């Protein structure tokens, strides 16, 4: 069996590796990068994702959410409190402001420890789930508004024919802006670009091991816990890796640099943070091989996780015997 550790693997494709991204993606798999719940891919030298970032200061941050943390250092929720729209000129200068930005640090670590240390006691300001692209139309290779999309990946796969789409969204960071611990909508794949800006540090559970992740989860939130079934789906809480290490959760971390792709698998939770004022974009994507995890993923009921239009259909085919239920949670 490929990396049996589940350790977190680097790629460095060729500009011809780089042709064909499901090709590539099946690769990586072969030599069990999916094991590890993430990958980083490196992109060929003589790829870009578009010619410069001079004018990205226009894009409009309708909700920017500042997320306000409660708990302690190493176990806490986050809320998204929804502020006055602002554009990415004037969120890039916030981020930069002696109120916001990063601290001075020694290097990665240090400011990993910063981190935990006073995540919680400081509100940063998230531009999250913007709908769009940075990529130039005419990047062909690993363009992420260019996918395939899920829909017809089930289609080629199980032939049924569904509404929805599946486009690309900008997260635009800044320092200790976090991810809280999640696997995609309907444990789907993940692919991230950091287009520029400051680094994002991400950890991992092995797909192997996302139960034990989900029974410490409900251990330190019980309230949460008792609430809904799924409330990770929620996307609102922290466990640190001092944490995560004490109760024996198997996890990896690692740094992810302008220029850098990240691929999330099926059922690998994640969370993670910003270092500075960063601009990535991200979008899910489906394999064959996920389609057994769609059909088994969770599902919150509760009514707080609340998404979007295409998750009906996937809800509707592949777990018609939750979909009633699981759509008086989305009315
Ligand atoms: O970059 C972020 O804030 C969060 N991204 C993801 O969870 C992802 O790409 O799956
Ligand atoms: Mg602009
Ligand atoms: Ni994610
Ligand atoms: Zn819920």
Redesign the pocket.
């Known amino acids: 069996a490929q990396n049996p550790n589940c350790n977190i693997m680097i790629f460095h494709p060729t500009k011809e590796e780089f042709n064909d991204f499901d090709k590539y993606i099946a690769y990586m798999e072969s030599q069990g990068a999916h094991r590890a719940g993430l990958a980083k891919i490196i992109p060929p030298k003589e790829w870009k994702a578009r010619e410069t970032y001079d004018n990205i200061s226009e894009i409009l941050i309708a909700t920017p959410l500042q997320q306000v943390a409660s708990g302690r250092a190493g176990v806490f929720t986050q809320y998204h409190k929804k502020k006055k729209a602002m554009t990415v000129g004037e969120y890039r200068h916030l981020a930069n402001s002696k109120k916001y930005q990063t601290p001075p640090h020694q290097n990665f670590e240090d400011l990993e420890r910063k981190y935990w240390k006073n995540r919680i006691y400081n509100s940063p300001i998230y531009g999250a789930d913007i709908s769009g692209s940075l990529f130039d139309e005419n990047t062909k290779q690993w363009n992420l508004g260019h996918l395939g999309t899920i829909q017809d990946l089930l289609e080629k796969e199980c032939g049924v024919v569904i509404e929805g789409v599946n486009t690309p969204y900008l997260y635009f960071g800044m320092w200790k802006t976090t991810?809280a611990w999640?696997?995609?909508d309907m444990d789907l794949y993940?692919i991230?670009y950091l287009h520029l800006g400051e680094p994002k540090t991400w950890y991992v559970v092995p797909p192997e091991h996302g139960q034990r992740l989900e029974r410490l989860a409900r251990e330190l939130f019980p309230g949460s816990s008792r609430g809904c079934g799924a409330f990770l789906r929620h996307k609102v809480a922290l466990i640190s890796p001092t944490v995560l290490k004490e109760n024996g959760i198997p996890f990896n971390r690692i740094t992810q640099e302008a220029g850098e792709f990240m691929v999330?698998f099926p059922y690998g939770y994640?969370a993670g943070f910003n270092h500075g004022f960063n601009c990535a974009e991200?979008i899910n994507f489906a394999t064959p091989r996920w389609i057994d995890y769609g059909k088994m993923a969770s599902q919150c009921s509760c009514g707080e996780a609340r998404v979007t239009f295409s998750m009906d259909a996937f809800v509707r085919i592949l777990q018609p015997e939750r979909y009633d239920l699981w759509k008086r949670g989305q009315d």
């Open positions: 991810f999640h696997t995609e993940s991230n999330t994640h991200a």
